[PDB]
Design an enzyme around this catalytic site. Structure first.
Site, short mmCIF file in Angstrom:
data_model
loop_
_atom_site.label_atom_id
_atom_site.label_comp_id
_atom_site.label_asym_id
_atom_site.label_seq_id
_atom_site.Cartn_x
_atom_site.Cartn_y
_atom_site.Cartn_z
N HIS A 341 -39.51 -4.42 44.05
CA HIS A 341 -38.25 -3.71 44.08
C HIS A 341 -36.98 -4.56 44.14
O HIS A 341 -35.91 -4.10 43.76
CB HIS A 341 -38.23 -2.70 45.23
CG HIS A 341 -37.23 -1.59 45.05
ND1 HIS A 341 -36.66 -1.29 43.83
CD2 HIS A 341 -36.72 -0.70 45.93
CE1 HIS A 341 -35.84 -0.27 43.96
NE2 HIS A 341 -35.85 0.11 45.23
N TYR A 455 -32.21 10.58 51.85
CA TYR A 455 -31.79 9.61 50.85
C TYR A 455 -32.21 10.05 49.45
O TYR A 455 -33.36 10.37 49.22
CB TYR A 455 -32.42 8.24 51.17
CG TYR A 455 -31.90 7.10 50.31
CD1 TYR A 455 -31.01 6.17 50.83
CD2 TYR A 455 -32.30 6.95 48.97
CE1 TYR A 455 -30.53 5.11 50.06
CE2 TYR A 455 -31.81 5.90 48.18
CZ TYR A 455 -30.93 4.99 48.74
OH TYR A 455 -30.45 3.93 47.98
N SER A 457 -31.40 8.35 45.46
CA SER A 457 -30.71 7.29 44.73
C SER A 457 -29.95 7.83 43.52
O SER A 457 -30.35 8.82 42.92
CB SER A 457 -31.69 6.21 44.31
OG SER A 457 -30.99 5.07 43.85
N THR A 468 -27.14 0.87 42.56
CA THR A 468 -27.34 2.27 42.90
C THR A 468 -26.35 2.70 43.99
O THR A 468 -25.78 1.85 44.68
CB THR A 468 -28.76 2.53 43.40
OG1 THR A 468 -28.97 1.79 44.60
CG2 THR A 468 -29.80 2.10 42.36
#
EC number: 2.3.1.21
Length: 625
Positions: A341, A455, A457, A468
């Site tokens: 990531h 959350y 994105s 992001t």
């Protein structure tokens, strides 16, 4: 030729003229932060936070923001957030497994026999290398988000824009309501890996490397996929080498080295140096610099749960977790991309994924009846060897122990809600994305009686080195609507409920558009704290607030993809008492793949989501709850 696309518009045509990522007005950021706090805090907590926001906005925050703005103007070639965001991922010491690395699984080839493991590993591999070649050649179409595909995603536009210099090209697209995206991360797809170093990891790339890395049963193999002249190796020869690898009958090593990539980053940083010390630099460089890592699992998928565990973590022996990405192919041909990531925001990965799915299924390099090239693969494929000391063997064992015990705590399950999806919701004038997020809020209220930090994105890649921004789906509107549905469903008419849903949707739509425009609050506040720390200042009191800690302890962590190539995706919770909620709203159905650790219950959450979507669709149909 060796290309899967032939763009007349150079891949990177718009990069020079991308708009700079805006920094919001601090006043707007403070308001937006408080707006997202409203549903999470009690009155006494909220008042404390509001007072800290005032202090911040008029004092230390005002000052940090002035410096952030000045720094941005000194650095107009990049964005204010890109450096700080890389730094946060790369400085994190936690295992990348579960904490950060997600997966997306391919749909099968719709031609049955093309799901044979050898055939599909060959076709996926060749298509991936074709992607690499198309990218290098500038023959990949630019990433562009069109408002009106029918005027701007046309050969007629493409034929004109190619004549506009890169210094001005973004303006051409803009005037047709087309938004080119940043592509500065795309190169890290290939020949790239994350190297563990003390304090802060390193991203490594070697564009000169022409070999693929393959893991099977925890063994490491390399062979060339590009020849000396830069052409793709004959697919029939690639086929032969993979069959060769699949034919290896050696059992799993006593100490499978791939385990180390799952360790704490300081631990792996120490063990890697010991490998170097023990003469393994050359073997590591071959691993590090490979085009990507192809992982051949020698078992079929039992079910979606088994699938999800396999693609997300596996058994620890057969993924090189540090690699930009691992392309995984199972015995029944089930395939996924598990990826690291830190190196990008995953937009590169999806583009790659979509092209590779299309190319491999519509233009496969080999057939299930293809006869492998008569070659001598023992010469072409090197089986790598690590010189393992007593301390490294001890480290692999401890890596395995940590891995197995953590994975034991991880549960995953899914639902396919079949009553309806995107087409029904759009008819009702609702954002499908907003309805899914509402369902999760509602489910969590039913299950736990709480409203918690959530959350989602949003890409900011419409801007130069955009990354992001956080959409905060937990709003006063979702909270009111969930409370109505859960705590007293007989108290409201269908009409009342429908209008509450429209308000959630409209606000979520608003937050989505603002986030894409860089007008969330999360990146702004983070960049301010980074700057404070980087200048050697004590952390401002705003960030010491429990409400801030809580806002960034994301119990409901959500992600979606919209693609014909993707069967499902998955990721672990970002916090110990969290859920990892991968969802998709299809035309006629809604999928959710949810993970949890010991402290939450994903199965029950899924029953609650089912119930919430059932209620939601009832109220939209005119029916009482």
């Amino acid at each position: 030729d060796d290309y899967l696309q032939h763009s007349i518009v150079p891949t990177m045509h718009y990069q020079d003229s991308l708009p700079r990522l805006p920094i919001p007005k601090l006043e707007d950021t403070m308001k937006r932060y408080l707006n997202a706090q409203k549903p999470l805090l009690d009155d006494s907590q909220f008042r404390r936070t509001e007072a800290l926001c005032k202090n911040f906005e008029t004092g230390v925050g005002k000052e940090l923001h002035a410096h952030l703005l000045a720094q941005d103007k000194q650095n107009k070639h990049t964005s204010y957030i890109s450096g700080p965001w890389f730094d946060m991922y790369l400085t994190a010491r936690d295992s990348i497994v579960l904490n950060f690395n997600p997966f997306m699984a391919f749909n099968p080839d719709p031609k049955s026999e093309y799901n044979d493991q050898l055939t599909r590993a060959t076709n996926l591999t060749v298509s991936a290398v074709r992607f690499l070649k198309t990218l290098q050649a500038g023959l990949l179409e630019p990433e562009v988000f069109h408002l009106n595909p029918s005027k701007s995603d046309t050969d007629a536009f493409k034929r004109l824009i190619r004549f506009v210099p890169p210094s001005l090209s973004w303006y051409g697209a803009y005037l047709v309501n087309a938004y080119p995206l940043d592509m500065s991360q795309y190169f890290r797809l290939f020949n790239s890996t994350r190297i563990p170093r003390p304090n802060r990891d390193e991203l490594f790339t070697d564009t000169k490397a022409r070999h693929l890395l393959v893991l099977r049963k925890g063994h490491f193999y390399v062979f060339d996929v590009l020849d000396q002249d830069g052409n793709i190796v004959n697919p029939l020869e690639i086929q032969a080498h993979l069959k060769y690898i699949l034919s290896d009958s050696s059992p799993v090593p006593e100490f499978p080295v791939a385990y180390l990539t799952s360790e704490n980053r300081d631990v792996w940083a120490e063990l890697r140096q010991k490998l170097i010390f023990d003469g393994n630099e050359e073997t590591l460089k071959k691993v590090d610099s490979a085009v990507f890592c192809l992982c051949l699992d020698d078992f079929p998928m039992k079910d979606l749960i088994h699938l999800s565990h396999t693609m997300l973590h596996g058994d620890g022996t057969n993924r090189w977790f540090d690699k930009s990405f691992n392309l995984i192919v199972a015995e029944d041909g089930t395939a996924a991309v598990h990826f690291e990531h830190s190196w990008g925001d995953g937009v590169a990965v999806l583009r790659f994924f979509n092209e590779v799915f299309r190319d491999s299924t519509q233009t496969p390099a080999i057939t299930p009846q293809s006869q492998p090239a008569a070659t001598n693969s023992s010469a072409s494929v090197e089986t790598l060897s690590f010189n393992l000391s007593g301390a490294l063997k001890a480290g692999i064992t401890a890596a395995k122990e940590k891995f197995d015990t953590t994975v034991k705590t991880l549960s995953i399950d899914s639902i396919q809600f079949q009553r309806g999806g995107k087409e029904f919701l759009k008819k009702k004038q609702l954002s499908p994305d907003a309805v899914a997020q509402l369902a999760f809020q509602m489910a969590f209220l039913r299950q736990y009686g709480q409203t918690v930090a959530t959350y989602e994105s949003c890409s900011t890649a419409a801007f130069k080195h955009g990354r992001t921004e956080t959409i905060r789906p937990a709003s006063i509107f979702t909270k009111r609507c969930s409370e109505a549905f859960v705590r007293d469903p007989s108290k409201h008419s269908v009409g009342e409920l429908q209008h509450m849903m429209a308000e959630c949707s409209k606000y979520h739509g608003q937050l989505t558009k603002e986030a894409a425009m860089g007008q969330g609050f999360d990146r702004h506040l983070y960049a301010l704290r980074y700057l404070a720390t980087a200048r050697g200042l004590n952390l401002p009191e705003l960030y010491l607030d429990p409400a801030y800690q809580q806002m960034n302890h994301n119990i409901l962590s959500t992600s979606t993809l919209n693609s014909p190539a993707v069967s499902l995706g998955g990721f672990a919770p970002v916090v110990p008492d969290g859920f990892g909620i991968a969802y998709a709203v299809h035309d006629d159905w809604i999928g959710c793949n949810v993970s949890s650790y010991s402290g939450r219950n994903a199965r029950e959450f899924l029953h609650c989501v089912q119930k919430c979507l059932e209620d939601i669709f009832d109220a939209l149909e005119g029916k009482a709850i």
